[PDB]
Structure formats: structure tokens, C-alpha cells
Amino acid sequence: FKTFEWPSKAAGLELQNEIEQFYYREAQLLDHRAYEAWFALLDKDIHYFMPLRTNRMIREGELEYSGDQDLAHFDETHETMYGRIRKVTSDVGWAENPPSRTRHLVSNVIVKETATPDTFEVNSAFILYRNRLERQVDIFAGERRDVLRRADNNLGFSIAKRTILLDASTLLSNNLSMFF
Amino acid sequence: FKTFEWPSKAAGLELQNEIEQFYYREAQLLDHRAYEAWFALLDKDIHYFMPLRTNRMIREGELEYSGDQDLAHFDETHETMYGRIRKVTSDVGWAENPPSRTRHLVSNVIVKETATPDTFEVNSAFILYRNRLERQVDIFAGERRDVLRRADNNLGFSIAKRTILLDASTLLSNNLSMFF
Amino acid sequence: FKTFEWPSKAAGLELQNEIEQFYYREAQLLDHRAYEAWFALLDKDIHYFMPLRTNRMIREGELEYSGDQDLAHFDETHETMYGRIRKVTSDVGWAENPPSRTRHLVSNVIVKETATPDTFEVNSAFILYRNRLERQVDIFAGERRDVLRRADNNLGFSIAKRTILLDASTLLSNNLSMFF
Amino acid sequence: NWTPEAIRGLVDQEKGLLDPRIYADQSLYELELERVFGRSWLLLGHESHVPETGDFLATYMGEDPVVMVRQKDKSIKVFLNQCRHRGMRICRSDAGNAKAFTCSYHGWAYDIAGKLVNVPFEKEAFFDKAEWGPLQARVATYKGLVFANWDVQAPDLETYLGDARPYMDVMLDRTPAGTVAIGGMQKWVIPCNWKFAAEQFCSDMYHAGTTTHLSGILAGIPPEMDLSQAQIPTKGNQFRAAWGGHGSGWYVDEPGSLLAVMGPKVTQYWTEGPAAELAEQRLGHTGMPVRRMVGQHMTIFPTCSFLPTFNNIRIWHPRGPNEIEVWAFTLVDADAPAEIKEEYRRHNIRNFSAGGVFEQDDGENWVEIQKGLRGYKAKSQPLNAQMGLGRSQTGHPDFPGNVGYVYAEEAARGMYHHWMRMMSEPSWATLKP
Amino acid sequence: NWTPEAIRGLVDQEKGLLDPRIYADQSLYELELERVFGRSWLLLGHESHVPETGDFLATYMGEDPVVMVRQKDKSIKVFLNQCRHRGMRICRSDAGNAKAFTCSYHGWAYDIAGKLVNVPFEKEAFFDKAEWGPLQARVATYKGLVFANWDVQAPDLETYLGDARPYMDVMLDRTPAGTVAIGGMQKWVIPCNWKFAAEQFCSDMYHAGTTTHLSGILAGIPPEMDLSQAQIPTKGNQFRAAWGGHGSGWYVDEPGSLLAVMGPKVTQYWTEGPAAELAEQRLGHTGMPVRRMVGQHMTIFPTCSFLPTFNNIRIWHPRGPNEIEVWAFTLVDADAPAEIKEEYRRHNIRNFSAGGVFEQDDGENWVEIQKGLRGYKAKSQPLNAQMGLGRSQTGHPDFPGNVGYVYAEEAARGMYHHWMRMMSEPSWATLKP
Amino acid sequence: NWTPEAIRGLVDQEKGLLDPRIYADQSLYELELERVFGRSWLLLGHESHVPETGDFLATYMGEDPVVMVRQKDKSIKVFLNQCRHRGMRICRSDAGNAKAFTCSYHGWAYDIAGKLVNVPFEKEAFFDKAEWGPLQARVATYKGLVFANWDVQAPDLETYLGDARPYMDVMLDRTPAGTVAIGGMQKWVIPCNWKFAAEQFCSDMYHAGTTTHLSGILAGIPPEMDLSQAQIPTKGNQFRAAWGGHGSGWYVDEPGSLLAVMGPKVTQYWTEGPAAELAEQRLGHTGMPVRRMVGQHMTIFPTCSFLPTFNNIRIWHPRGPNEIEVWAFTLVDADAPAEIKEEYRRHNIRNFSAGGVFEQDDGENWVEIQKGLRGYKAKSQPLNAQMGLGRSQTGHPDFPGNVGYVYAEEAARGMYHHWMRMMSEPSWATLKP
Ligand code: FES
Ligand code: FES
Ligand code: FES
Ligand SMILES: [Fe+2]
Ligand SMILES: [Fe+2]
Ligand SMILES: [Fe+2]
Numbered sequence A, B, C: 001f002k003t004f005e006w007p008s009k010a011a012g013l014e015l016q017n018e019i020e021q022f023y024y025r026e027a028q029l030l031d032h033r034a035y036e037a038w039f040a041l042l043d044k045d046i047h048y049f050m051p052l053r054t055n056r057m058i059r060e061g062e063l064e065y066s067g068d069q070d071l072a073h074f075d076e077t078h079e080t081m082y083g084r085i086r087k088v089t090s091d092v093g094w095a096e097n098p099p100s101r102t103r104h105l106v107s108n109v110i111v112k113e114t115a116t117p118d119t120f121e122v123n124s125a126f127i128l129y130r131n132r133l134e135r136q137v138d139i140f141a142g143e144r145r146d147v148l149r150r151a152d153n154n155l156g157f158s159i160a161k162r163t164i165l166l167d168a169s170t171l172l173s174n175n176l177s178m179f180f
Numbered sequence D, E, F: 001n002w003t004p005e006a007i008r009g010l011v012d013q014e015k016g017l018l019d020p021r022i023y024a025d026q027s028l029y030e031l032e033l034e035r036v037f038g039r040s041w042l043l044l045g046h047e048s049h050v051p052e053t054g055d056f057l058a059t060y061m062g063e064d065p066v067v068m069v070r071q072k073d074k075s076i077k078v079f080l081n082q083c084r085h086r087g088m089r090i091c092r093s094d095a096g097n098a099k100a101f102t103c104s105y106h107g108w109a110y111d112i113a114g115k116l117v118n119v120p121f122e123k124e125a126f127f128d129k130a131e132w133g134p135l136q137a138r139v140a141t142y143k144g145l146v147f148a149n150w151d152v153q154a155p156d157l158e159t160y161l162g163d164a165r166p167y168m169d170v171m172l173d174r175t176p177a178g179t180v181a182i183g184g185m186q187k188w189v190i191p192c193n194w195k196f197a198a199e200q201f202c203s204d205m206y207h208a209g210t211t212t213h214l215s216g217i218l219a220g221i222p223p224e225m226d227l228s229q230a231q232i233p234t235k236g237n238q239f240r241a242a243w244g245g246h247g248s249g250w251y252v253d254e255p256g257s258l259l260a261v262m263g264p265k266v267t268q269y270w271t272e273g274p275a276a277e278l279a280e281q282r283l284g285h286t287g288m289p290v291r292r293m294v295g296q297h298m299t300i301f302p303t304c305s306f307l308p309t310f311n312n313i314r315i316w317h318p319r320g321p322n323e324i325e326v327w328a329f330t331l332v333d334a335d336a337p338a339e340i341k342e343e344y345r346r347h348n349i350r351n352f353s354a355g356g357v358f359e360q361d362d363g364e365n366w367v368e369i370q371k372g373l374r375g376y377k378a379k380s381q382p383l384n385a386q387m388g389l390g391r392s393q394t395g396h397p398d399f400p401g402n403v404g405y406v407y408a409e410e411a412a413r414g415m416y417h418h419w420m421r422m423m424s425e426p427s428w429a430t431l432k433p
Helices: A013-031 A035-039 A058-063 A078-088 B013-031 B035-039 B058-063 B078-088 C013-031 C035-039 C058-063 C078-088 D004-008 D026-035 D157-172 D194-202 D214-220 D255-262 D264-271 D273-282 D338-352 D359-372 D410-424 E004-008 E026-037 E157-172 E194-202 E214-220 E255-271 E274-282 E338-352 E359-372 E410-424 F004-008 F026-035 F157-172 F194-203 F214-220 F255-271 F273-282 F338-352 F359-372 F410-424
Strands: A042-051 A072-076 A101-113 A119-132 A136-150 A157-166 B042-051 B072-076 B101-113 B119-132 B136-150 B157-166 C042-051 C072-076 C101-113 C119-132 C136-150 C157-166 D042-046 D055-061 D064-070 D076-080 D095-097 D100-102 D109-111 D116-118 D136-142 D145-149 D179-181 D186-190 D236-240 D247-252 D293-300 D304-307 D312-318 D324-333 D402-405 E042-046 E055-061 E064-070 E076-080 E095-097 E116-118 E136-142 E145-149 E179-181 E186-190 E236-240 E247-252 E293-300 E304-307 E312-318 E324-333 E402-405 F042-046 F055-061 F064-070 F076-080 F095-097 F116-118 F136-142 F145-149 F179-181 F186-190 F236-240 F247-252 F293-300 F304-307 F312-318 F324-333 F402-405
Touching: A013 A035, A013 A101, A013 A119, A013 A157, A013 B013, A013 B101, A013 B119, A013 C013, A035 A078, A042 A078, A058 E095, A072 A078, A072 E338, A078 E214, A078 E338, A101 B101, A101 B119, A101 B136, A101 C013, A101 C101, A119 B136, A119 C013, A119 C101, A136 C101, A136 C119, B013 B035, B013 B101, B013 B119, B013 B157, B013 C013, B013 C101, B013 C119, B035 B078, B042 B078, B058 D095, B072 B078, B072 D338, B078 D214, B078 D338, B101 C101, B101 C119, B101 C136, B119 C136, C013 C035, C013 C101, C013 C119, C013 C157, C035 C078, C042 C078, C058 F095, C072 C078, C072 F338, C078 F214, C078 F338, D004 D410, D026 D312, D026 D410, D042 D055, D042 D064, D042 D179, D042 D312, D042 D324, D064 D145, D064 E359, D136 D157, D145 D157, D157 D293, D186 D359, D194 D293, D194 D304, D194 D312, D194 D324, D194 D359, D194 D410, D214 D255, D214 D338, D214 D359, D236 D410, D247 D410, D255 D264, D255 D293, D255 D338, D264 D273, D264 D338, D312 D338, D324 D338, D359 F064, D402 D410, E004 E410, E026 E312, E026 E410, E042 E055, E042 E064, E042 E179, E042 E312, E042 E324, E064 E145, E064 F359, E136 E157, E145 E157, E157 E247, E157 E293, E186 E359, E194 E293, E194 E304, E194 E312, E194 E324, E194 E359, E194 E410, E214 E255, E214 E338, E236 E410, E247 E410, E255 E274, E255 E293, E255 E338, E312 E338, E324 E338, E402 E410, F004 F410, F026 F312, F026 F410, F042 F055, F042 F064, F042 F179, F042 F312, F042 F324, F055 F312, F076 F145, F136 F157, F157 F247, F157 F293, F186 F359, F194 F247, F194 F293, F194 F304, F194 F312, F194 F324, F194 F359, F194 F410, F214 F255, F236 F410, F247 F410, F255 F273, F255 F293, F255 F338, F312 F338, F324 F338, F402 F410
Parallel strands: A042 A157, B042 B157, C042 C157
Antiparallel strands: A042 A072, A101 A119, A119 A136, A136 A157, B042 B072, B101 B119, B119 B136, B136 B157, C042 C072, C101 C119, C119 C136, C136 C157, D042 D145, D055 D064, D055 D095, D064 D076, D076 D136, D100 D109, D109 D116, D136 D145, D179 D324, D186 D324, D236 D247, D236 D402, D247 D293, D293 D304, D304 D312, D312 D324, E042 E145, E055 E064, E055 E095, E064 E076, E076 E136, E136 E145, E179 E324, E186 E324, E236 E247, E236 E402, E247 E293, E293 E304, E304 E312, E312 E324, F042 F145, F055 F064, F055 F095, F064 F076, F076 F136, F136 F145, F179 F324, F186 F324, F236 F247, F236 F402, F247 F293, F293 F304, F304 F312, F312 F324
16 A cells, blocks of 8 residues: 655644544544444445455565455445444344444544545554453554545544555454444 | 543643643653652542443443442542552562553543633543563553643643543453553 | 653644654554665664663662663664665565564654754654564554654654663564564 | 372372462363362352342353343242353343343243243254253352352252351341342453462461561551551461361451451441441351451352451352452442441452452462463472461360461361362262261 | 264264264364364365466465465466475465475475475485475365365265255356456454354354344345344255265245345346346256255355355364364356446455454354353253254255255254264275265 | 383484474473473573672573572572462562562562571471472583583583583683673563474574575675675584584684674684684684684574574573573673674674564574474474485594584484483483483
């Protein structure tokens, strides 16, 4: 995917604060299982994407990530996400009933303004800490590359696009029952 | 505990920075074992709380946390916290002599102005990394719900209330010889 | 090492954001294996230091870290750092070919101004997630104490001095093939 | 292989010697699950945990997950938390209320008694449902506390406890109202053998009265008082069960030890007033001065430990020879003043939780012991269990049974001797009292 | 040591009983690597994973690392990913193209065929290079799928597969062009025995037709529907292989169930139109009505599993008795419309990736089963495998081989019986079909 | 359980064959702790790690924790870091100064000799303190280095080392003023078997003269030139110890290889001027051209390894068959100039640290080898130790003992043969030199 393209003219302090506070609020919604609230942040043209990552020699490093027509961990539209919210808020959704306990620690927020005013490309790092049942702990880490629009909702922003670059090849977790 | 009720009007950049800095300063006191300096931040009316978490079915989700008249991991006043500082600084306090090596990574800071001026309800996320003796590593993750007051000390603030919501049911560590 | 001597007056909001963004850009270079771009950030008078930490009784806490004339995990100069860059970018550098997958989550940024204009002493905390091959996961936590300089370069700053205080005695990891 | 002869040589109570291999050996551990945990009375909690019909608590018996659930007939049932179809956990939450139990795998349904009542597509695909419910356990209550045992050939709970009952009654039988459990159950993990934890509450006051808990006491004593004051208690006794490997120790006539751990308000409650006077009357058939008895510890073999004066109670779950899980909770007299219920609550959290000023140091000890026992030479010579050897007698005026001095390892030798018998002797025909 | 008598008693096909120790025992696992994985036909992937000369794929056979690499002559060789000098891994990336392979330790150089062609300082310090190349495996292809086997004595793939081939062809033989593998191979770790995973795709439709996948169904059906409005499929059949422990299960005339998992376009493609009619004409030699066969699951013993109707294919890699790795990829007809290939890709991610709306629930069940088996009593009583006992016959008008009802365990009983035979019989003279 | 016959058939030094099961078998490891580590001389550090009375270092002998401690009479005593009471670690810090040692559990006090001097409540509850102190070990010093052995029957350090001593003297006996240790000791964890690491330093120069350290050499050469300016060393020798399985290897007349690793200032110190001329005078009685010997590697069997030319030294701590800990430190000549000490320090960090340009790649190979050995087939065929077979002899003008070419496995064959001997022969009556 190559190093994120931060502008030399950094985003204003007012703008830097808004995006961070948006991610802090977002993580709060997810960590407290307010899934309907979080889902309302996703735009109708949302593309939710987490590609596979592989072990390659440096000379073939451009094959590290899976592509548009390869399999992925997530490759979701607004419609497919809606079914997942229905499953995760369902009594018969065994993988999250009883639900897990997660923590999204968000940092390393870099903001880029796009050709379209009030639309921003955002880079952020994270650790997702998942704890399930008695003693299960899966620790995920990675970066998120978002496209965010200024929106007239409770958080002041909506998610237009999300790519999650996870720092794993083989997944050490048995499932991805959580949202990134 | 539900999603933290952040204000629609977000705290100004000056205040956001001041609170973030305070926590960074506090984490520097704890990770460098400045226990007497840390304890000086606590108000006489402090409540230092960390409830138990249990695995409940969605239908019984309101029973996830232990209450005010139940057991907890921590439920401390100024008097009892003083006893803990006396132990942790002791040459015969074996659990922290030799001392552990901790790291408090603080992020996700959400500031809420209260009805009292210069008193703030602050939500924050953390990973506490703890390393003991030869090869022991305990990784804690959770959130903190604090009530902070402006104070006349080297850090700028005082701690009036602290609730730690730890992302664990069964604790995977042998003890909690660290402060949160 | 004792608590970081933070200034009484905190750094301005512009400066706090400049240093933070420098580290977010720096972590982007490392996490995307831009070792050539990262090396260009180091001034020629760089001391890249990472002492050993030992378990000591409270009565002997002044002997925790190793000294100037002891062994270290890293004790590097510009000349020696370049050799390391030459090894990691090498196709015949086995320990990093295939490369690892690193994540530097950076927070706790405290900025101190020195007696030299445009030169700053900065404290920061981190969690370095390292994932290698199929199943290898190494989690590092620690503290960075840097002397940074205003620079007419890409990231806005250059590195004059770095001490990395790692929260470990025995490394649980088989090597330190990554940069901090 | 482990012959009965080889097992007998691991514990020598006459000489006061213990083979360190008992805390580390993997094949010895597998036999403990069968010969010890497979036929002993294991504590699961308190009656008030499951006060109404359908109330359940997910817990463990050894490494076997079990459901403890209250019935329509006001009894408590304990069945194996495993569906006999393909192994799935029937009860998937810690605690709550159930009308039925359904398996998430193939939909096999159970009533709260553990009987299999419905199998999906039974008419089409199928065998009798009465024989395919999860394995049941014998359940018996002792004044609030609920115990379980798989072995139908093992002696009943009352017999199993024997002359240990009086010392339990110190905590359990103080009022006609009974004891109630305080909400919440602390769970944490220690990388150590269960026998270390069981022995310490069985026989070991020597650790609390010497070095382990100096900082725990420092945290308890008034801010104006430094450690060089605090008076180390010496007066005291120790009980070894006639049969079963149970044990208990206590300080006599030293309220200052209770003062440091539980505060002034609890010390008053335990020693002075109508409530303390009533308890001594009720325990009159034992003849014990319970108002003089403080700082008590006790273990019911194998893994039921508690601290009667402090109302702290704990179950040890084995997780291999090198690990345990500590499940802790606390009791209070049902009719006790609200202030007294609160003081017992605060001080148990402060002292004996995962982050407690006492428990921290207990865990620190056990972690390093298990680390050391990984070595060859560290398992090559016996450990000294010679304390108070031949110093006990069964004719004490105040305390009934085999009684010695507070700092002794007589109860320990009893705990290990019984353990040794459990492992070497196949049949209850020679094992029972 | 396990005697052949003790092995035979672990699985009872006549009574429909399974000893649960087969999922947990370490000694039985070591034997599984020798007697099961060391001489079985194991899937490594597809021919299209390695199209060009020098293309490779690093994968596993049991816990043995292997290199699948396409040769100059268009054949495929499979050799142990280990240097016979001191054991270093020869091929150190997952996939790509290679001109040669070289050991990073001492530079022992190998060609793409897996032959040792260069030893540094050979003339100065040495032994024949032709003899010291890594161990080679037998490679066989079935309609695009690539299988491998160590044993020179084992039957060939076609013989090993037997009367299960018809049911494989439902996925693999639909078009003259053949199947191609969509790029990317998902990998995730589940802490559970491989036999649970193998059986579920072999015989277990029961779990999907009852409770496990109620929420997965909820995810697929339109926003207007609630779960109670979704018809539960009941009609169908189960296949048990004549030999090998292979098995498949499918629904008959149940288009609604395919609609929920794979969507309107795939359901149209599979049942109606030119491509659906061409598949039925090609599979007419079996007599099966493929356009009516939906929701199919299948297992090729030991660790090869697929969902033929969904085109989802997966390999289970054993990692001790308490762990597997799941390596999953998907297929499409090479000449299928791009719109259909994309729909197949989408819903395979949506339902069957590690974060799939079906998969999440599968591993959730398996984790607790393996957890439960840590206990002594959890392994004291046999598991029930009595479903559909004595109900299957070989004279079904539509489907070839031993055919019963869809919710049965005749396939499972066949799997564990072959497992038993594999573990108890050293010679292929008794085992061969 | 292993019969002597089965052990002997794991190492064939005649054919040059190794059974790969020696690196992976759990049962063999448990025997190693008893038969190899329980009676071999193991390096604990340097005399200058504990220079003052009461100075200590906490280290390991196998998986047994021990305490190095300097006494009043200037001798070093080594004892088990375990209290005989209940197994608690006596010394709880990595290093420092002690006036005594106290157990944290029950307060058993020990002086700096490991003698039990105080037992709390002894008069009241107790047994002879002189018999209950921790287990003592035989301590012996070779020119600065501190070794320990449990076995009273085992040969003395000198006889144990034998004809390996001249090769140790290259690093140690260069000054009358002796060596000192640079402060600090690096501890890291590699998931491989100890025999891989110990063999490499014993017999494997082959890896440094081929592929392993291509990037390490690249790090050591000037910025303007690459590996095409780096010449491969092909001149040198290897030594196999008469008894003990010790071994060394080195380059002769190859000053370029020292320069790339240790820089110009060390190269000149090692090869020219007063200190190098003094070393040549002192070491002349061995006949060796010490000034021309570079890149030396050495293993004192079992787990004491060093690189004499670089002054790097390490102990391998076994942690199961599949894990070790590496404890590394560095020496200098006590009277060597400050600039020379600094260069030895700097370059040891750059090269042989956990993150060293050389070390990284060494450990990388070992990790992947151990992973492979989880497989059945990966252990089914023997490994090749056939390098330099029958080419060594005891007739060499310059170097004493059984000497061959630098790229050879004669020392490796000697190491494993001795390992095999110690594992299969129970009595020192047959094992003694
Ligand atoms: S496991 Fe099959 S229904 Fe319970
Ligand atoms: S391991 Fe020695 S060259 Fe492959
Ligand atoms: S363990 Fe050392 S004093 Fe009891
Ligand atoms: Fe204690
Ligand atoms: Fe399923
Ligand atoms: Fe090397």
C-alpha cells in the first residue's frame, strides 16, 4: 500500500481535533456495543475492506496484499454490513452472545483534505484488544485508511470508505466477530 | 455502563491539550515509580473504583458489572489508598520489590465540562503493559472514567473520582500490583 | 532514569501538534519499510541508545539501567546505523526477508524546549507490535527520550539523540530486527 | 508408571518429608483429576448465589465445567456443562436465570434439572433421552456452602468433614439468620500448583506471622504507626482433622491482628456485644471461646479454603500441575448491621482481592516456587515439613481434636498424608473414616 | 503405547458411539501423524495456484512443511520444505515464482524440481548430491485440485476417492473449461481438534438446520423478513463413501436456502439457464439432478473439506490435539460470467471467511468443546453418534452409493470407522479398498 | 524411557549421521537435564561479575536457578536458588551486593555462603540447620571464567577441558593482568534447541563462509563498496577435543574478515604491536601462530560458547526441547587501552546483540529449523554430518590435537558423540576422559 501521503501543509488544529474526537467517539460506540448507532455513521456508498496479507520476498513485495478480485477478510457494502449488525445484535448470534469485551485504542491520526471540500482522507493506527468469555485474548494491531465526509449526524462525520491494513498474515484469532 | 455521554459542544483545544498532558504526566509518574508524587494528586474525597465484569447473555446484559454493594478488584478511599502507597514504597513489599516495569499508553481522551467550573468528566482509553522479573508480561486494556479538578500542583489537576472499566472477566495476571 | 522533567509551562498548541505529526509520519515510514526515507531523518551526530534493564531491589534501583561503558541492545552512531539500514534493505538480509509487519502506536508526547532555539527534548510512550512469518507475535512497550531539531526536510524535524527505555529485562523476542 | 508403592514414598509424615515432584509431575496431575477431584467434595459457592428457581452459576469441578442450578423443589442440582452429543457447553454464561437450557450446536434441549427433554428431528433421525443427559453430581449443603462430588461410593459430606465442622461453624453458624454471600465473585490466575494454595490456608500461619505479609500489615496499621511497632501475634493454635486432610489455624487473645486486617468496627463485632455473645452461646456445644479466636485460616480438602474471622472464602481450580484459578467471594451474617456488611466488603477487597495488599505477596511467592521446580536438582531432594513434629495432642480443654501450636505443619502433614492415600488406595473400602 | 485392540474400542460404528479421548489424547495425535497424515491423500490447493514454470506455494502435510512447485514440463512436484543438512526451511515465502531454491543457512542450492544441485565447498570437504535432496511426495490431480501422499504403497487418488468422485464432480466438472481458484488464501487458527472440523463438513448438516446458523441466516435474508419467516430446509440426503471415510450432504428442492447464503444471481446461475443445463448433461452418467442439489457439504478424509454449491474449499492443518489452522480458498467456473465470479467471491467472504457470518459461529462451538475436554469426567462417557443408525441403503433412484437422510451421522460413523482402521492397521494390504 | 542401545543409534559419528529427534523429543530433554546438565561443567560468568565480598549474580544451571556469590575469603560459592522449606527463590534480584539472603515466604535466613543461620520460631516449633541449607555446587575457575558442576564424581575442570585449553587461552591468557568483563549481560529468548546453537559455535564456520551472514558483512564494509569487494575466507582450521565434545574453528592469514567484524582498531590490537607480541610470547608454549588466527569460534560442551577473536561469550539456557535463553556478555584485557575496550564494546553490540547484524540471522535459521521438526516426516530421515569425514589428524605443526579444515563437521561429530556417551552411560567410571 506504501507510506500514507500526508500533505506538507498539515491539517489545522480545529480539523485535527474533530477527526480525533470522531474516532474516539466511534471507538466508544463499538466498545459499548451500540451497533445501531455506529451503523448509522456508514454512508450508503460505503466500501468496508480488509485485504489478506502474505509473506513475500522483497523482490515480490508488490504481491503482499490481496487485490480487488481476490478474497479478503472483509469486503463489504452497506447492504452486507446491515446483515452483520442484525447478526451481532441478535440473541441467536452465538459468537457475540454473550458478547466479547473490546478496546479500540486509536492514535497516529493524519488528516488529508481531498479535491472535494468537507471530504477527508484519514490515516490512523490502532490496537484492538479483544477479550472473550473466561480467558480468550486476541490482540489486533494495524492502520485504517478512511474517507470521511462532514455529515449532519450526532458525530458530525460519516464513513464513506474504510480500508483496514492488519498486521497479520495467518489470523491468530478463531474469528473476526468485531468491527474495526 | 453504556457509551460515554460526550457533549455535543466539544471542549476547546486549550482544554483538550491540558487534560491530555496531565494524563501523560501522570503516566510518567507511575511508570517511573514516583508513588508519593502520584498520591499527592488524589483528593481527600476520592473514590477509586474498578468493578468485576462477568459474561452475561444479551438479555441479562444489565448485570455485567458488579455494584456499589458487591465485591470489586478495587474500591478505595483516601485512607486505604494511602496504605497501598505505603506498601508499594516499602523495602518488604515483595510484590513490587524488585519493582515491576510498567507502561501506561494513554489515548482516546474525551473531555466533558460539568456543572462545576474547573471540574471535568474525562473518558480515556489505555493499554497498561506490565513486565515482571524474568519473563512475566501482563497486558491490561480498558477505559477510565475520571472526575478531575483544577489544582495548585506541578501537574495542574487533581483526581476526585476514578472508575476503571477493565476489559477482562477472569484476570489473566496473578495480581494487580500496579495502579491504573 | 527518574520522571521526565516536563516544563512548568506546556508547549504551545502549534508545537505540540508539530512534534506529534512528526512521530506519526516517522511511524508511517517504519511501518511501511521506508528505511531509506527514515535514515535521512537522523543527523550525523546521532546517538541511538537502548540500555539493558535489570531486576534490582528498591535499595539498589540506581543500578537498573546499564551505563555508558556497559553493553546495550543498541548503542549506535550515524555510521553504524547506516550499516543496519544496509542490512535490512538487503535481499540477502534473512531476518527481515520476508520482512516483518510492524505497528508503532505513538502517544504520551511531552515536549520540552531547550537552551538552543529550534532544538527540543521530547518524551513519548509507545507500543510496538511485531508480526513475523506465520504465527510470530512480539509486543514491545517503552519510552522514547529524543532530542529533536527543526529541519528543512519532509517531516519537519531531524533526530539528534534517541534513548529508548524498553519495558523488559529478558527480551521475549528472538531478535530486535526492527527500529524504535 | 506410578505404582501405589511409588506414591506412598512421596509423602512421609513420620519424618516430615515431601517429594517436590508432586507439585510438577504431569502424570501425577492426571491421577489427581481421577483419584482426588474425581471423588472429593468440592465447593461450588453459596446457596444465596442461586436463591430462586432457575438461578444458575457456571463453575468448575477440577477441569470439568459444571452448572449449579436451583430447582422447582428448592434443591440444588449440579450437572456436567457438556452436551453428550458432541461436547458443546450447554450453559454459556457465568450466571443468571434459566427456564431451560439449549445447546447452541445442534439444539438439544434440557430442563433446569439437566434432563434431556427435546432432540430436534428425533422422529425422523432416531435411543432414549433419559440416558443421554449430562453427568450428574451428588450435591450437599453445609450451612450456606454448597458442595459436590461425582463418586456415589464416597462418604456423605457431613462424614467427610468430620471434626472440622466446629471450626467452620465459627464462620457459618453465628446467627439463626445464617450467612449470605456478597454479590460478585473475583476470578484470577496464578501459575502455581493447587497444593501450595491449599496447604497455606490449611496449616500455614508461619508465612503470615513472619515475612510474607509485613507490607500487608503496614498498609493496615494507622498512618501514625510505622512497622517497628505492630505487635507480631504468637499466642495461637492449629487443628488437624482426624480424617480428610483438613486443617485450621488461629490466633488467641490478640485483637490487634484483626484490627490491622479488618478495622476497628469489625473487631468490636467479632469480640464484643450481643452478636459476639450470641455466637459463643450457639457454638457452646463445641466449648470454644470464639471471641478469643482471630486471624483464622482453614482448608477443606482438596481445594476449599477460607478465612473465617475475615469471612473470605476461596475455591482453587486446578489447571495443570503448574497453574491454578482462584475464585474468591465473601460472606456476611444475614442480619448483621449494614455498616458491618460494608466493612467486611471494603476490607476483603482491600486485603484479599487480586490487587489486595495481602494477596499480592501470596501470589508473588507461589509464582517463583513453580518456576524453580522446573529444574532437575530442585526436584531431587525432599522439602522440610518437620515443624511441630510430635507436638500435638487430642485433649485440649478449649479446642476439640488434634491441636498444636499456631506455627506448626501438623495440618500440612495431614493434608499431604490424605492426598497420598487418595492417590495410592483405589477403593473407598480402605479410604473411608 | 496404544494396542490395536485399544484403538478398535475407541470408535463403535455398530452402536454409534465415540470415545471422546480421540479428540484430546497426545499419544493418539503422534500416531495420527504417522498412520493418518503420513500416508493419506492431502489437498495442497489448485493447479491455478501455480500456473507458470517455477511458480510455488508453501503449505503443509500434517505438520510437515512442503513446497508445491510447477515444473518446466507442466507437471507438479511436492517436496519437504526442509534442508537435509541441518533442517533449514528451503522455501521461505508463501507464494511466488522461483528460478531456484536456496537454503539460507549454508547455501545448499536446489532446482525447482527439488534436487540438490550445488553444495558450497563440496570438493574441499566431501556423499552424493542426488541422494541428499529433500524427501519427495506423490502428486496427483483431480480436475484441478492437487493432492499429495508420502506412501509409495497407498492406493492412487482415483482409487482412494472411490464412489465419492460423483459428489466432487458437482463442483469440479460443470464446464469443459474447468474451474479456477479465485486469488488469495485465508488463514486462521482455531483451538480445536481437526476431527470436529472434518466431520462437520462430512456429515453435519444438522448444526446448520437447527441452532448454530440461525444468526447467519438472519444476515442473508432481506431486511423485511424476521427469522421466524425463514423456511427451515428439511428435504435432502447424506452420502457415505464405500471406502475412505468420505462423506457429503445436500438439500433437495430447497432453493430458498441457497438464496439466503449466495444471493439471487448465484441461485439463478446454479439452477436455471444454459450453464445449469450443461452441468446436468455432463453429470448424467451419475444420474444426479444437480440443479436440485443445494447447500452441499463434503469431506475427503482426512482434512480436505468443501461446500460444493458455494464453491468454498478448505484445508485443516493439525496443530496438536487441541488446535487447527484453517486455510481457505474459493473456486469458480473458468468461463463463468465476471458478474457471477464476483458474486461468488463476495458471499464466500461474507459467509465463510474468519469474519464470516457463518464461520464465526462454527469456531465458537469448537473452542468450548475442546475446552470442555480438558476435564476428567468430560472424557469418561462416550459421545452419541447414533443419528440415522441402520437407515441408509445403496438403492436410491437418484444418488449413487450409500445414501440416507440429510440429518444423519452415517457419514460421520463412516469417517471415524475409517479413522479407526487407519490407526489400527499398519499394512496397506488390509486397508486397501 | 530410552534404552542405552536406542540412544547410541541416534548419533553415528562413523557415517556422519544425526537422528533429528534429538532436537525435538520431550523424553530425551528430561534425560539431558539429568545426564548432561546435571553433571557437566556449566559457565555462570566471570570473576569480575562478583568482585567484592557479598556481590552476587542470579543465573541458571539448566533449568535450575543458582546464586554466584563472592565470599569473605575471596572464593566463589554457587548454590541452588531454592529454599529447602517450601521452594521459594532465596535471591530475588538479578545482581547486586548482599550482607545475607532471606526467604520472603517464611523468613528463613541464610548468610552469603548459602548456610542456613536463622529459622523463625525454631525454639518454639523445632532438625539441624546445617543439613537444610540449599544444595551446593562444585565451583571451579579457568582464567577468569566461572564454571559449576553438581556431581561430586565428575572430573575436575582441567581434566574436563583437556586439550581444548590452548584454544581458550587465545582469548583469556593474553595478559598477566587477566581479562575483565564489560558491564551488563544481554538476555533474550530463541525458540530452538540448545544443540543447534552449541554446535554452531563448536563446528560451524561453514555458515559464516556461505549465506547466513551476507547482510552482516555488508553492514561492516565501507558505504561505497558491496559484497563483490568482499572476499570469501577459505584458509583456516578446525579442532576436535580429545575428550568432552569441545571444538573450535578459526581462519588463518585472513585479516580482512576481522576488519569487517571488529573494525581497524581491534584488528591492529589483535595482530600488531606490544599486546599482540606479548600474547604471542605467552601462548608460544602451545606452538600456535595466535596473531594469524581470526574469526575463531568455540564451544565448551555443553552450553558454554564464545568467539575468542571478538571477545564475545555466551551461555545457552535450555527451556524445553524447543526453546533456549541466550545470556551474552563480553570480555576485554584488564590493562587494554580505553579506546580498545570501547571498540570491543561497540562492535559486540552492533554484531552480537539480540538486534546485532550478525546475530539476527543466526537465530533466524534456528527458529525455522525447530518449527519444521514438529512434523513426522521432518524427523523420519537422518541429517547430514558428513562434512570432512576422516580428514582430521593429530599431526599438525601449528595446532595441537585432532585438527582438520575450517569448513568441516569433525567437532560437530565429536560434540554429538560425547552427548550420546553422556546420555547412554550412567557411570563416570566409563565416561571419564
Ligand atoms: S453438541 Fe450436538 S447438540 Fe449439543
Ligand atoms: S541447513 Fe545447512 S545448508 Fe540447509
Ligand atoms: S520457603 Fe523459604 S522460608 Fe518457607
Ligand atoms: Fe497469605
Ligand atoms: Fe457451520
Ligand atoms: Fe553466525
